[PDB]
């Protein structure tokens, strides 16, 4: 036949997915690949707090829900993205008064939750609670609720789904070092103490030439410690323009984190934050910096999307 890179994935137990988002839809050769060559999807917006509660109390998943609908109509899993964030949250939360805010977070994690109950296999339910030496971010929940928010996060959304994984989700923590060390005591700590975590996200938003040489000791180590692993929103960027060498270094890189993960049965899987250059984030966040994904602006297969399939085999 020629099988996709969702069908290599499942064929090893693991799904091969795509980020995507709203305004993306039109696109009709865009879907087409979107809808037949993944096996997973994440919505990247219209699941985040700014889009569900933009008002206090009054939640709206009309947008989120088109992402589903979409999903399922090609038989694609479904990863929640993503409960509690520091961005994308709307102004009205910075005036909840201190006490009030755990319960204002529980209260919006019980809605959405419960809303898409059964129609997802993971939820992102709290995401980059760490900075980079490994102290925590000073979210305004960190500030006015206190450490134990991401607990509390982890406690209301397995009470609203408790079938759904519940993940941790971060960027550069995909080798060993002072943040994933954080993470890695956190999670433990977590199944210490009995506070539900079912897995670790790692974004995976990597640089060309320079991926973690202990990436796979360290998706080991969380795998040792009782939860899944899944690379939630991978990416390689280089420094533009691309050349066949950058492109050649790329692909290496691809593929060595897709092996990467699949020499650990517990990585669950891989999800590239969208599939094309043509919608990446990267240019707009990274001056300078772009074409970190599989298929080019044009939508060609890049040598990236060779090593991909090989390492899928
Ligand atoms: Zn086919
Ligand atoms: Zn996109
Ligand atoms: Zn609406
Ligand atoms: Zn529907
Ligand atoms: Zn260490
Ligand atoms: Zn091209
Ligand atoms: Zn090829």
């Not at 008002?55 to 088109?66: M, P, V």
């Amino acid at each position: 036949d020629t099988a996709t890179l969702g069908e290599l994935a499942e064929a090893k137990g693991r799904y091969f997915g795509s980020a995507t988002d709203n305004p993306e839809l039109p696109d009709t050769q865009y879907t087409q690949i979107l809808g037949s060559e993944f096996s997973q999807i994440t919505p990247e917006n219209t699941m985040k707090w700014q889009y569900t509660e933009p008002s206090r109390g009054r939640f709206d998943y009309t947008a989120a829900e088109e992402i589903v609908d979409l999903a399922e109509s090609n038989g694609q899993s479904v990863r929640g993205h993503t409960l509690v964030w520091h961005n994308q949250l709307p102004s009205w939360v910075d005036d909840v008064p201190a006490g009030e805010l755990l319960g204002v977070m529980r209260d919006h994690i019980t809605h959405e939750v419960d809303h898409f109950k059964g129609r997802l296999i993971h939820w992102d339910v709290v995401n980059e609670a760490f900075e980079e030496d490994g102290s925590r971010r000073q979210s305004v929940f960190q500030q006015k609720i206190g450490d134990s928010y991401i607990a509390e996060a982890f406690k209301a959304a397995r009470a609203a789904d408790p079938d759904v994984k519940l993940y941790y989700n971060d960027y550069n923590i995909e080798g060993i070092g002072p943040k994933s060390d954080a993470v890695y005591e956190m999670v433990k700590s977590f199944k210490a103490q009995g506070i539900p975590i079912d897995g670790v996200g790692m974004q995976a938003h990597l640089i060309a030439g320079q991926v973690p040489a202990s990436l796979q000791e360290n998706i080991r180590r969380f795998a040792d410690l009782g939860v899944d692993v899944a690379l939630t929103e991978l990416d390689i960027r280089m420094t533009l323009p691309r050349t066949a060498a950058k492109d050649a270094q790329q692909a290496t890189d691809y593929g060595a984190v897709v092996e990467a993960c699949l020499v650990v049965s517990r990585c669950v899987g891989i999800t590239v934050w969208d599939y094309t250059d043509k919608y990446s984030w990267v240019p707009s966040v990274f001056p300078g910096q772009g074409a970190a994904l599989p298929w080019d602006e044009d939508f060609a297969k890049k040598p990236a999307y060779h090593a991909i399939a090989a390492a899928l085999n």
